[PDB]
């Protein structure tokens, strides 16, 4: 639904 | 902007550094990279947007998690803070990390 960020 | 500053074009949205007056602008229809350029990322800014443009900002990278605040016109620096976000929180967009410009 939303844009996400990179994981650890 | 104040007197002498080049105005945002009608289809352009800008963030302007509070410290330096230097700007980062995009036309309607464009977004930043994963983060804003290193010289401005996370720095204190205000929005200066042309009449047809709306600036979407996030305090996080990549315009993410509905942490999105919307800004039109020439915004006072203090009005970058405590702003309604898409996700229902009120967030600080004074030091943004990512940006998109859309039609108002
Ligand atoms: C969030 O990022 C994705 C790509 O990873 C898309 O560009 C999406 O359109 C972005 N969301 C917003 C609000 O610009
Ligand atoms: C963020 O995470 C989602 C999983 O919920 C996706 O993997 C998406 O591609 C990720 N976005 C980025 C920029 O890495
Ligand atoms: C991606 O980074 C953002 C901040 O930019 C958040 O920390 C988010 O929780 C991160 N997502 C993942 C899956 O670690
Ligand atoms: C994921 O990677 C990006 C660069 O690709 C960012 O550095 C981001 O802050 C990273 N996410 C995590 C949770 O460290």
Q: 3-state SS string over chain B?
A: CCCCCCCCCCCEEEEEECCCCCEEEEECCCECCCCCCCCCCCCCEEEEECCCEEEEEECCHHHECCCCEEECCECCHHHHCCEECCCCCEECCCCCCEEEEEEC
Contact B10, B50 (CB under 8 A): yes
First to last CA, chain B: 19
Contact B99, B24 (CB under 8 A): yes
Nearest CA to ligand 2 atom 7: A4
Q: Resolution of the experimental model in angstroms, please?
A: 1.1
Please indicate the experimental technique that yielded this structure: X-ray
Cβ contacts below 8 Å, chain A against chain B, sum to: 17
Question: Which of A1, A2, A3, A8 would best serve as a mutation to test chain B binding (most B beta carbons within 10 A)?
Answer: A3
Among A1, A2, A3, A4, say which to mutate for ligand 2: greatest number of ligand atoms within 8 Å of CB: A4
Q: Which residues contact B84 (CB under 8 A, 6 or more apart)?
A: B69, B90
Q: Calculate how far, in angstroms, residue B3's C-alpha sits from the geometric centre of ligand 1.
A: 35
List chain B domain ranges. 12-103
Q: Which CATH code fits B12-103?
A: 2.60.20.40
Q: Which residues contact B97 (CB under 8 A, 6 or more apart)?
A: B35, B36, B41, B42, B58, B59, B60, B61
SS3 of A3, please? strand
């Amino acid at each position: 639904a939303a844009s996400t960020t990179t994981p650890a | 902007g104040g007197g002498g500053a080049l105005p945002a074009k009608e289809n352009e949205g800008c963030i302007v550094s509070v410290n330096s007056g230097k700007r980062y602008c995009l036309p309607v229809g464009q977004r930043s990279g994963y983060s804003l350029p290193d010289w401005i990322v996370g720095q204190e800014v205000y929005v200066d947007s042309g009449a047809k443009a709306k600036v979407l900002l996030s305090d996080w990278d990549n315009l993410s998690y509905n942490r999105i605040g919307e800004f039109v016109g020439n915004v006072n620096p203090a009005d970058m803070k405590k702003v309604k976000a898409w996700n229902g929180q009120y967030l600080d967009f004074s030091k943004p990390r990512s940006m998109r410009v859309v039609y108002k």
